[PDB]
């Protein structure tokens, strides 16, 4: 049965102007959820789009698809225009949830040519042995992606596909695939990294 729950909520805050600020939320969901953010009710990051491709790849299978997704919203140079209500919204195709906070800027040399950031990722994905699973990372711009596992490059082959959007798609998962997969987003100025985690559950 589908389920969704806040794991790490937003909290309201009076923050200094002109100092970089970051919000984080984490949501548990089955099937996999996406997160988008709103400011005073208006969409500012992310979308409601879901992993339709993996659902096709798991045609005919009993699917576990559960885990925690995380997202971060960065305000580079907070000013009075950034004061208001921030919402982190989760959606899994069946249910929604949200966590909300009021952020107020207090106070008035704040800065381009910077590394990307990874703003949404699979903190954990559980899926049954024998199915396809996806580890998701999304950046704040178009990027070049590389994935690592066990300190080695993940190469594209019959089992692993690295997509241009930041997904790593792993077919026919087995217990030996359990562990951490690091997504690395690069542009011409530098890189951002994030860890994701896969758990292939037992198939009885």
């Amino acid at each position: 049965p589908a389920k969704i729950k806040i794991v790490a909520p937003l909290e309201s805050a009076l923050i200094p102007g002109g100092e970089t600020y970051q919000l984080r939320c984490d949501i548990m969901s089955t099937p996999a959820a996406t997160i988008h953010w709103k400011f005073n009710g208006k969409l500012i990051q992310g979308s409601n789009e879901l992993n339709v491709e993996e659902k096709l790849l798991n045609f005919g299978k009993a699917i576990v698809d559960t885990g925690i997704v995380a997202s971060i919203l960065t305000i580079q140079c907070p000013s009075a225009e950034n004061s208001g209500t921030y919402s982190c919204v989760g959606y899994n195709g069946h249910q929604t949830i949200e966590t909300v906070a009021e952020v107020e800027i207090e106070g008035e040399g704040c800065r381009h040519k910077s590394a990307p950031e990874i703003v949404f990722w699979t903190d954990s994905r559980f899926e049954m042995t024998g199915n396809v699973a996806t580890l998701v990372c999304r950046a704040n711009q178009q990027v070049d992606w590389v994935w690592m596992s066990n300190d080695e490059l993940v190469k594209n082959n019959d089992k692993f596909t690295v997509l241009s959007n930041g997904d790593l798609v792993i077919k026919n998962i087995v217990w030996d695939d359990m562990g951490t997969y690091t997504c690395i987003a690069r542009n011409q100025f530098g890189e951002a990294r994030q860890e994701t985690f896969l758990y292939p559950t037992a198939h009885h």
């Binding site: 954990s124 042995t129 860890e195 559950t201």
Partner: protein
């Protein structure tokens, strides 16, 4: 048996999932036992979700 580094990463992610499902029904010391069990041995989805709070 998983490599030790995969067991390491697993323990944190598994206890987080168990605590999120079970809430206050799962003491962190009991979630840790399920995390250790299921990060050295492969567990089912049902066991991971229910072992720390069998009455849901």
């Amino acid at each position: 048996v998983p490599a030790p580094g995969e067991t390491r990463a697993c323990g944190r992610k598994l206890i987080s999932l168990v605590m999120a499902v079970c809430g206050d029904l799962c003491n962190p010391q009991e979630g840790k036992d399920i995390a250790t069990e299921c990060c050295g041995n492969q567990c089912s989805d049902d066991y991971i979700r229910s072992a720390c709070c069998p009455h849901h």
